[PDB]
Paper text:
The structure of AhlB was determined to 2.9 Å in space group C2 (Form 1), using Se-Methionine SAD and subsequently the resolution was extended to 2.5 Å, using data from a crystal in space group C2221 (Form 2). In the AhlB pore one of each of the subunit conformations of AhlB pack together to form a dimer and five of these Type 1/Type 2 dimers assemble into the decameric oligomer. Within the oligomeric pore, AhlB adopts two subunit conformations, which vary at both the tail and head regions. In the Type 2 conformation residues from both hinges adopt helical conformations, forming sections of α3 and α4, whereas in the Type 1 conformation, the hinge 1 residues in α3 (K152–L160) remain in a loop, indicating that the Type 2 conformation is the fully extended form. Furthermore, in Type 1 the N-terminal helix (α1) is sandwiched between helices α4 and α5, whereas in the Type 2 conformation the first 15 residues of α1 are disordered, with the N-terminus of α1 packing against the C terminus of α5 in an end-to-end arrangement. Thus, the Type 1 conformation has a five-helix bundle at the tail, whereas the Type 2 conformation has a four-helix bundle at the tail. Each subunit of the pore is constructed from two extended α-helices (α3 and α4) that join the head of the pore to the five α-helices that fold into the pore tail. In this soluble to pore transition, changes in ɸ and ψ angles of up to 180o for the hinge residues and movements of up 94 Å result in both the β-tongue and α3a/α4a (D156-L186 and G225-Q246) unpacking and the secondary structure rearranging to form the two 140 Å extended helices (α3 and α4), constructing the head of the funnel and presenting this hydrophobic head to the membrane. The first 15 N-terminal residues of the Type 2 subunits point towards the centre of the oligomer where discontinuous electron density is observed, perhaps suggesting that these residues may form a plug in the entrance to the funnel resulting in an inactive pore, possibly explaining the lack of haemolytic activity of AhlB alone.
We show that the orthologue identified in A. hydrophila (AhlABC) is a haemolytic tripartite α-PFT, requiring all three components for maximal lysis, and we present the structures of the soluble forms of monomeric AhlB and tetrameric AhlC and the decameric pore form of AhlB. AhlC provides the initial single leaflet insertion, assembly with AhlB then producing an oligomeric hydrophobic pore, and finally recruitment of AhlA produces a hydrophilic fully active AhlABC pore. Structural and sequence analysis suggests this method of pore assembly may well occur throughout the tripartite α-PFT family.
Numbering used by the authors:
A (entry chain E): 159 to 204, 207 to 341
B (entry chain F): 17 to 203, 208 to 337
C (entry chain E): 54 to 105
D (entry chain D): 15 to 205, 209 to 337
């Protein structure tokens, strides 16, 4: 499609360049011919000067031809040219957007894959908590630990690491709310 | 600025826009119907936000904010002087109340979903407008380059025509002098009085020929520079509107972000109310010290709900 | 193709994202309980109570 | 506004994980850049994951443990504390020395983890620099070619201008000739074949020029179109290389910043280890020494614990 449009544009632009060339050439022939036609005309009023009065008028007719031909082709072409360049710019935009959507999908795919990883890590984190609570239940039941020293463990954790988790929770909630804690 | 202030700004800004009229540019007929439809819809969305959604959000949060302001804690132990019977009713009434608020929180979130989609639609329609204008201008610029080239070429025809006219004029002046010397040269001399008059006729020829070619060429040039001035006007208007829509697009995109943040804030409130409901329910149907565990947890959870309330209130002001 | 992709985005935005946020409430709640345990069991309390 | 060391590495990791692998299947000249980029990227994501769910937590853990122990044992008894056998005091010092030794080992281990982190970051930073360099060289190459193509297009435009000139010239001869042929024809009906030939000669020549020009034209526009397709192709390729290139330049910077941050972490842990070592020495030499020599070493150990606490705050700062 694009190749065809560029071809079509090249033709129209050529047509228009041609027409304008005709008009410049045309004008020169008319002025040139009017001079030849005028000298040849007052040389017949004195030999055989018809060979140049024809050449002079030939020039003028050719000239006027090129000019009026160029003018038709021109006034005719100009409208079509705008339509063609718009079609091209439109196709370029639409191909670019189609590509952009594709890339968009690829990116979303990656976001999802990253989300799987993240979710998996969350599951494993909860699994450690459950398993670790299980160990604590076992250790208490077997009499390896007591509620007196387990209490101290949890209160130490409350002073530091758990307090930290709670902080991170507030902070995370704030950041996803777009608020300053 | 608060999340709500950002959406509010976008809404006020979109409502103030004026629909476009590109009837003077046939090449933009489609951009017009696109822009005006897009705009009309966006104003719709804006109105809905300003007079229905924003107030609704502020309302629902006020109600929640007041209730939990009063019930800022959960009695875990059994307050001084109450039958265990009365305490269970007092916990059950709060649990019911919290459940009602959870539903309201959840409903607010649906409203916000709708808001997000409206904003996303507007943002998208705007991006589309800019893209379609850009492509029309990209097209017009290809054409403009050609027209400038075409004008430069035609200028040759005009230079030529004028050269013809000056050449003619010189022959006439030159001939009138030769004709005058040849005339007073019998003193034998018709060969130059012919040449002199020949020059004058040729000259008058060149002059009237040049004048045709000239009036004709200036017309082709004027026809070309009218197309150019038209394209320049069209490109200028597309750019003006384009930049407008680029700006609106940004405001809308910012509004999406803000609305998304609001969603997340309400989701925390809902989830946190859920935790509170669970903690109360499991405390109402549990042993003597297990009851205290769950109710202590419910009390921590209420503090959390109050936090969530401050966050939403911040988003609004 | 695009319409379907937007579908996928919606599913994330209005189904998964809330579930993830709920996860934070659940974490917040678990630790609310964990820090409550030593507050309700006074110093020196049955191994029986602790296990429950 | 300056972020912690861990925040900087964290950012780089999150940033690298979000990248999408490239597909230059439309550009044969970039086949090698593709396999380089994608391999580099894949590896980098590996490193990122390892940092985010294994190394960063490990660092935070080890420091928490250290931080708690020395929070409690924030000082060293240099004299015999009120009411204790000298026997009990020596056990209390020996238990701290053992404990400190355990922490020194943990500190030292953390440092090895960090070494590994540094090498991962250094590898990623390097692979990225490599990507940019290889893209740059492909673009440098394509630009040499592009310059030539522009030149080649300018040359061909002559052929096209020529062809069109031929066609206009032809047209004028035909119109001119048709007029001469018509006057010469109604001059034979008044006696003029010398000009009817000249007139028809013009028309034949003209029609020649027109059909000749039309071939040369359709042919030349094709050569020009063939050239500007190669150019548009090269422009697309250069544009893509530049887009990705700038991406990798940015990633390279993030990685380089991450190296710095990781190096700072190394140095912080080195101070902790060395400082714990001093504490171990001071305790050991105080446990096996005279009455006032004992007090010297234990006083020094007390100064040294303050130093360990400082080192702990520094690491904690690096993390938050
Ligand atoms: Cl309209
Ligand atoms: Cl409602
Ligand atoms: Cl538009
Ligand atoms: Cl290639
Ligand atoms: Cl370790
Ligand atoms: Cl590369
Ligand atoms: Na809209
Ligand atoms: Na790593």
């Amino acid at each position: 499609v694009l190749a065809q449009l560029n071809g079509d544009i090249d033709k129209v632009n050529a047509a228009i360049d041609g027409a304008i060339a005709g008009i410049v050439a045309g004008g020169l022939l008319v002025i040139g011919g009017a001079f030849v036609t005028a000298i040849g005309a007052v040389a017949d009023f004195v030999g055989t000067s018809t060979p140049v009065v024809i050449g002079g008028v030939a020039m003028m007719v050719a000239g006027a031809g090129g000019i009026t031909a160029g003018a038709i082709v021109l006034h005719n072409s100009l409208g079509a040219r705008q339509d063609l360049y718009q079609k091209r710019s439109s196709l370029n935009s639409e191909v670019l957007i189609a590509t952009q959507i594709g890339n968009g999908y690829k990116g979303l795919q990656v976001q999802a894959q990253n989300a799987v990883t993240a979710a998996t890590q969350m599951s494993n984190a909860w699994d450690s908590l459950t398993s670790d609570l299980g160990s604590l239940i076992t250790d208490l039941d077997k009499g390896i630990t007591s509620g007196d020293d387990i209490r101290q463990l949890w209160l130490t954790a409350a002073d530091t690491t758990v307090k930290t988790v709670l902080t991170d929770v507030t902070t995370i909630k704030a950041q996803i709310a777009g608020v300053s804690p | 600025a608060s999340q709500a202030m950002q959406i509010q700004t976008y809404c006020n800004s979109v409502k103030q826009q004026v629909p476009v009229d590109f009837s003077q540019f046939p090449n933009l007929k489609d951009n017009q119907t696109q822009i005006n439809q897009g705009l009309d819809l966006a104003k719709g969305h804006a109105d809905l936000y300003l007079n229905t959604i924003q107030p609704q959000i502020i309302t629902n949060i006020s109600n929640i904010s007041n209730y939990f302001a009063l019930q800022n804690a959960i009695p875990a132990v059994l307050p001084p002087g109450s039958t265990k019977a009365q305490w269970l009713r007092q916990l059950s009434v709060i649990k019911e109340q919290a459940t009602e608020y959870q539903r309201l929180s959840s409903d607010t979130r649906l409203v916000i979903v709708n808001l997000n989609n409206n904003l996303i639609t507007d943002s998208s329609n705007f991006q589309g407008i800019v893209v379609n204008l850009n492509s029309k201008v990209q097209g017009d610029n290809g054409v403009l380059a050609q027209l400038n080239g075409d004008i430069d070429k035609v200028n040759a025809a005009i230079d030529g025509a004028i050269a013809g006219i000056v050449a003619g004029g010189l022959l006439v002046i030159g001939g009138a002098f030769v004709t005058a010397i040849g005339a007073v040269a019998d003193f034998t001399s018709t060969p130059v009085v012919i040449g002199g008059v020949a020059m004058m006729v040729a000259g008058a020829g060149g002059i009237t020929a040049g004048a045709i070619v000239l009036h004709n060429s200036l017309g082709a040039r004027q026809d070309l520079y009218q197309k150019r001035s038209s394209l320049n006007s069209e490109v200028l208007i597309a750019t003006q509107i384009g930049n407008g829509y680029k700006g609106l697009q940004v405001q809308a995109q910012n509004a999406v972000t803000a609305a998304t943040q609001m969603s997340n804030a309400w989701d925390s409130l809902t989830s946190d109310l859920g935790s509170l409901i669970t903690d109360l329910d499991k405390g109402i149907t549990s042993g003597d010290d297990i009851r205290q565990l769950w109710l202590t947890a419910a009390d921590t959870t209420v503090k959390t709900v109050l936090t969530d309330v401050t966050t939403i209130k911040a988003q609004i002001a």
